[PDB]
Amino acid sequence: NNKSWMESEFRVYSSANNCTFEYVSQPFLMDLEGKQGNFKNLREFVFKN
Amino acid sequence: ATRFASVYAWNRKRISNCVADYSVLYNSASFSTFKCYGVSPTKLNDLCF
Ligand SMILES: *[C@@H]1O[C@H](CO)[C@@H](O)[C@H](O)[C@H]1NC(C)=O
Ligand SMILES: *[C@@H]1O[C@H](CO)[C@@H](O)[C@H](O)[C@H]1NC(C)=O
Ligand SMILES: *[C@@H]1O[C@H](CO)[C@@H](O)[C@H](O)[C@H]1NC(C)=O
> CB under 8 Å, gap of 24 or more: what pairs does B37-46 form?
B45/B21
Q: How far is CA A18 from CA A15, A22, A24, A25, A49, in A?
A: 11, 12, 18, 22, 22
The H or E element containing residue B27 is helix B23-27
CB < 8 Å to A21, chain B: 14, 16-17
Q: What is the CB neighbour count within 10 angstroms for residue B25? A: 14
CA geometry: angle at B26 spanning B21 and B32, to 5°? 135
Contact call for residues B21 and B44 (beta carbons, < 8 A): no
Nearest to B12 by CA among A38, A20, A3: A20
DSSP state of A13: -
Which ligand has its closest atom nearest to the C-alpha of A3?
1
The closest alpha carbon to A22, from B7, B4, B18, belongs to B18
Q: What is the DSSP letter of B8?
A: T
Cβ distance B21 to B13 under 8 Å? no
The chain A residue lying nearest B15, using CA atoms, is A21
- A30 C-beta neighbours (distance < 10 Å), count: 7
Resolution in Å, one decimal place:
2.7
